[PDB]
Amino acid sequence: MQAKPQIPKDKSKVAGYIEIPDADIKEPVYPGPATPEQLNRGVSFAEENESLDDQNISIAGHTFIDRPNYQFTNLKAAKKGSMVYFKVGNETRKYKMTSIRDVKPTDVGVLDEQKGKDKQLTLITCDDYNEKTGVWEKRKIFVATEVK
Known part of the structure; x- marks a missing residue:
């Protein structure tokens, strides 16, 4: 049921790489809970x-x-x-x-992971972490879906 790819328990190791030209983005992603002290090293x-x-x-x-x-x-x-x-x-x-x-x-579509369509990529931003509720103050989101 649950997938089991090669996820390195080393939160300090590149598990993959996102790449987008429209945003000229090209950064690694660590396997772990999107934390501020960590994403500071990159993405996750x-x-x-x-x-x-x-x-x-x-x-x-x-x-x-x-x-x-x-x-x-x-x-x-x-x-x-x-x-x-x-x-x-x-x-x-x-x-x-x-x-x-x-x-x-x-x-x-805050996560769209409980739905039941096809593979999907949910995007989330992380900046100005508010310590009031312990969450990312602003949180813009974008989602895509596998093509043909």
Whole structure:
């Protein structure tokens, strides 16, 4: 049932690589719970139980406005139809944006991992972590789905 790819328990080791031209993004992702002290080293899945095969992979990346060339900084520049390429071990898959939610944050797609459609890539930003509720203050989201 649950997938079991080559996820290295070393939260300090590249588990894959996201790549997008519309946002000139090209950064690694560590296997673990999207934490601030960690994503500071780069990007990481949104949950520690994520895998390179979870029917729904949710990622979290930083976005410094004063750095138009970082993790999730340019992803905001991306737009619907913006395809992407998730690298894993010795192979690269691809997706096609088809449902932007960065608009209102409360939408039937905060994770879209409980739905039942086809493989999907949920995107999440991480900046200005608020210590009030212990969550990422702002949280824009974008989702895509496997193509043909």
